[PDB]
Amino acid sequence: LSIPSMLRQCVNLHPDGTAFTYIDYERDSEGISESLTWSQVYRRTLNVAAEVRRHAAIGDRAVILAPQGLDYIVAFLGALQAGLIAVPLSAPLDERVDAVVRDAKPNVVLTTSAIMGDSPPTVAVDQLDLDSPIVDDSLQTTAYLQYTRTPAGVMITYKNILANFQQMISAYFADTGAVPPLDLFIMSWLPFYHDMGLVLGVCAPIIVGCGAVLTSPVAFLQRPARWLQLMAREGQAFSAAPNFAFELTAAKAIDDDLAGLDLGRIKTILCGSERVHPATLKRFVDRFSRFNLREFAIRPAYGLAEATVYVATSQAGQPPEIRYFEPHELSAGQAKPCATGAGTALVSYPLPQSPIVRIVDPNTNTECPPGTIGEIWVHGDNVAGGYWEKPDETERTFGGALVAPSAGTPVGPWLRTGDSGFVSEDKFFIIGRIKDLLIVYGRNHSPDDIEATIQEITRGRCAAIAVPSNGVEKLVAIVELNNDTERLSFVTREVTSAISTSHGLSVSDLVLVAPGSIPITTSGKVRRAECVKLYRHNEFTRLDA
Numbered sequence: 001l002s003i004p005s006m007l008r009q010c011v012n013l014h015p016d017g018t019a020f021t022y023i024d025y026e027r028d029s030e031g032i033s034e035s036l037t038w039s040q041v042y043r044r045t046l047n048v049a050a051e052v053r054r055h056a057a058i059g060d061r062a063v064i065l066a067p068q069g070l071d072y073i074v075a076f077l078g079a080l081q082a083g084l085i086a087v088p089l090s091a092p093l094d095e096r097v098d099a100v101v102r103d104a105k106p107n108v109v110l111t112t113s114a115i116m117g118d119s120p121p122t123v124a125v126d127q128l129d130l131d132s133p134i135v136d137d138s139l140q141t142t143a144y145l146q147y148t149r150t151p152a153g154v155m156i157t158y159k160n161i162l163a164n165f166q167q168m169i170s171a172y173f174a175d176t177g178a179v180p181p182l183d184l185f186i187m188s189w190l191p192f193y194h195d196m197g198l199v200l201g202v203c204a205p206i207i208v209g210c211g212a213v214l215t216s217p218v219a220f221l222q223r224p225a226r227w228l229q230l231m232a233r234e235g236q237a238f239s240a241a242p243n244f245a246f247e248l249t250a251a252k253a254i255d256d257d258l259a260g261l262d263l264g265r266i267k268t269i270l271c272g273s274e275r276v277h278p279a280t281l282k283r284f285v286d287r288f289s290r291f292n293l294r295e296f297a298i299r300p301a302y303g304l305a306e307a308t309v310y311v312a313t314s315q316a317g318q319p320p321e322i323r324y325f326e327p328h329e330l331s332a333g334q335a336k337p338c339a340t341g342a343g344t345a346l347v348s349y350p351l352p353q354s355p356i357v358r359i360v361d362p363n364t365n366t367e368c369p370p371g372t373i374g375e376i377w378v379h380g381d382n383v384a385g386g387y388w389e390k391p392d393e394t395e396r397t398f399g400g401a402l403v404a405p406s407a408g409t410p411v412g413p414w415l416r417t418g419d420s421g422f423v424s425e426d427k428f429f430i431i432g433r434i435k436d437l438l439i440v441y442g443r444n445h446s447p448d449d450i451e452a453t454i455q456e457i458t459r460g461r462c463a464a465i466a467v468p469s470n471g472v473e474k475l476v477a478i479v480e481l482n483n484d485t486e487r488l489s490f491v492t493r494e495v496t497s498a499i500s501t502s503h504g505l506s507v508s509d510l511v512l513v514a515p516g517s518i519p520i521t522t523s524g525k526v527r528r529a530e531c532v533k534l535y536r537h538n539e540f541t542r543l544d545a
């Protein structure tokens with residue numbers, strides 16, 4: 001039923017089995033290990049549940065404001081144990097944190113003494129005696145709020161979680177009868193305050209019944225090779241990452257750091273949370289196949305917080321499948337398949353069985369014929385019931401109703417994803433986020449394709465954004481370069497020409513910025529939203545000024 005009850009079952013079956021292992025690279029460049037069996041994490045959880053019960057009631061929200069580590073896991077679990085709606089947030093570094101706190105009106109804050117320095121009662125869980133030897137007041141419905149201009153908290157129920165896990169276990173392990181191997185372990189460096197990192201690092205170990213090897217996204221960014229190192233531990237690894245993490249690892253990992261790594265036991269590496277670029281997948285597999293990385297272990301995956309996490313993934317037992325389409329028709333709105341190597345390449349996602357996806361005209365609420373691009377709509381029991389205390393926004397995002405649905409298609413409710421895609425053959429494809437699209441003379445260009453063009457030339461971070469000006473959208477590219485005045489001219493004319501010939505677009509402004517200037521998250525590739533208003537308020541410093 002609930003995560004607390006599943007954790008108590010983990011303790012019953014395998015009290016002394018290892019549940020969570022956290023590798024901390026902050027003091028020791030090589031990582032200090034600290035591990036909890038099922039019984040020990042349960043004890044900590046119960047102690048946190050006792051402490052939160054002094055401050056909040058069943059149903060109250062509990063904000064978690066801790067760094068990545070075991071204390072975060074035990075704050076979150078202890079909150080669910082005492083029947084509180086957890087709110088996983090990031091450690092203060094912030095304005096969106098106070099906006100979330102105002103929205104969720106929490107009755108307790110769970111944090112650590114270290115960031116205690118950075119009103120509801122505040123608990124430093126590390127300063128609690130967490131290993132001192134009941135509180136099962138768990139809810140059977142709402143587990144936690146997942147926060148993503150006003151901050152909207154996705155209500156995630158235990159039903160959402162279990163349904164998404166059943167869909168996930170079945171698609172990821174369809175080749176083994178929806179049974180994961182005995183050898184499975186979870187490895188993740190993804191932040192626990194993002195949906196991918198929370199469901200994979202914290203929730204999955206309990207629901208699947210395996211242990212997790214965990215670390216911090218700052219450890220991964222410092223030395224991406226550690227990711228491969230930790231996945232190559234004993235057993236069959238299951239991990240996940242955004243596309244730029246695949247690129248970064250292919251780029252910055254030294255073959256000396258990988259002395260004697262066996263990557264052949266890695267069960268699954270999901271690639272998600274952003275557009276999956278075939279070129280990235282090929283660079284990753286071509287560079288790490290030497291260590292026995294299996295190509296069928298790379299699994300592109302699509303989802304969003306509003307669907308708990310998972311919507312679709314590639315066929316189990318096969319390497320990712322790539323399809324090719326004519327780009328002029330793609331911008332026109334039509335998917336026309338073309339020969340291998342011609343046109344744009346898109347990762348083929350098999351139409352999922354559960355949840356179900358449809359391609360729908362956002363202006364008429366009617367399905368699109370195959371090959372016609374529209375908005376991806378999602379139906380299924382993993383789709384959240386709404387945004388916390390936001391009835392109107394809930395209605396606009398979750399209340400998709402299909403007019404004259406096709407045979408076998410529910411009328412509603414549909415989750416409108418904001419993503420543009422199409423169906424070809426019996427696979428569907430994701431173009432990208434609609435708000436990020438560049439519309440020029442009635443045509444639609446995707447910023448992921450523009451940035452993939454620019455990157456190959458720059459080898460750095462990009463953002464292709466749309467700046468409105470006197471009734472149209474103008475193309476602007478924020479381009480990170482390594483840090484003379486001719487060399488700058490070489491890159492500007494190269495990139496400008498590459499966008500001209502590959503897209504038929506004129507670049508209205510190329511902003512050469514230093515590395516780190518484009519807003520990125522720890523798990524977000526680029527916030528093209530933020531780029532637009534940083535550029536409009538002239539907050540960028542160029543290298544050629």
Ligand SMILES: Nc1ncnc2c1ncn2[C@@H]1O[C@H](COS(=O)(=O)NC(=O)CCCCCCCCCCOc2ccccc2)[C@@H](O)[C@H]1O
Nearest residue numbers: 168200204272273274275276301302303304305309310430
């Ligand atoms: N594959 C993709 N291609 C293109 N765009 C993608 C995309 N995925 C997300 N996006 C973009 O990102 C938007 C959503 O952003 S978001 O709300 O913050 N959330 C996200 O993006 C998260 C989506 C990730 C996909 C599935 C992650 C699996 C999670 C762990 C499995 O645990 C298990 C399960 C079983 C066994 C062991 C472990 C989406 O609206 C879309 O625009």
